[PDB]
Amino acid sequence: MATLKVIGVGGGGNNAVNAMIDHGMNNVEFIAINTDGQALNLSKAESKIQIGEKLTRGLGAGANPEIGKKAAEESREQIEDAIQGADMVFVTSGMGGGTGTGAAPVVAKIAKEMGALTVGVVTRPFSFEGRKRQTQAAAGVEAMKAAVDTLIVIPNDRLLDIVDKSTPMMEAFKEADNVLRQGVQGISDLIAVSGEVNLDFADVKTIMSNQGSALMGIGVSSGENRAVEAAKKAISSPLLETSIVGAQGVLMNITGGESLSLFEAQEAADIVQDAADEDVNMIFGTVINPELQDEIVVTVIATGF
Ligand SMILES: Nc1nc2c(ncn2[C@@H]2O[C@H](COP(=O)(O)OP(=O)(O)O)[C@@H](O)[C@H]2O)c(=O)[nH]1
Ligand SMILES: [Ca+2]
Secondary structure (H helix, E strand, C coil): CCCEEEEEEHHHHHHHHHHHHHHCCCCEEEEEEECCHHHHHCCCCCEEEECCHHHHCCCCCCCCHHHHHHHHHHCHHHHHHHHCCCCEEEEEEECCCCHHHHHHHHHHHHHHHCCCEEEEEEEECCHHHCHHHHHHHHHHHHHHHHHCCEEEEEEHHHHHHCCCCCCCHHHHHHHHHHHHHHHHHHHHHHHHCCCCECCCHHHHHHHHCCCEECEEEEEEEECCCHHHHHHHHHHCCCCCCCCCCCCCEEEEEEEECCCCCHHHHHHHHHHHHHHHCCCCEEEEEEEECCCCCCEEEEEEEEECC
8 A cells, every 4th residue: 555645845835735634635644844833833734844943943934945945955864754655755835935945846856765756736926926936936846847756837827717806815725725635635546446447556656757747637527428528627727837738648547337338438538638639658447436326537647748
């Protein structure tokens, strides 16, 4: 049974971890890493690492990414110890600030050195935060790409596409944080359930290892055209920098009840193949859950851009 860990680095990362913990998420372990002692005390993560106390006196990094970087480096052994034993690590962080920008790539590097398949899920700042934030974030994204196996990037400007004038900011943030949660959950479930055409952690590793950009999606539907609709939802990317277009490898799992037809499994696969507009090398799986009635769930992980 593969050991999955989700590590929040800095404020936005720790917000994403707290959102997942709010949901439940069993067989996933959470680590909270921050310079900011105030926030870190309000984490509900069972493992907390305060970094950079020597540098900051318990405060944040004040928007300087070199302080985040040095803070993580100076706590390398404590970070190693909290990671030790993980088969897979998700590092989540907001790019643009001092702690996430600087520390998240160090954390990712440590994870990969420890032997973990390492996935980054990070945000880019809103345009209203300005040019310097955007430039610092881009340097962070580049540093994350170098350090991780695969990287999912969520530009915060995309949240402006999914709100009306009244949508609470916290509701919008929860949509961004669902990218991480549903991805991690999708992988936990994939590993836990024995499929008729079974996928396992080694298939996740083949798709996610030393790649670059990634997409991780889930789609649920029922009734007429359920398979096409579930697959379309799984690959949709309103919040993602990296869409399905250009994907060269995909892990796709379909879960349905006993009604799950061969024809609709091919319909779903073809949606992904056609949307990619490449010769996709697909790792295909299927689960029959006889407790389902008319529901289908399609899980996609896409890489090789
Ligand atoms: N979507 C989202 N973005 C956030 C959140 N918190 C912070 N950010 C973004 O992440 C960037 C860095 O903020 P933060 O993580 O608090 O900085 P750090 O802790 O000092 O590294 C900000 O400039 C925002 O663009 C959050 O909860 N959700
Ligand atoms: Ca399985």
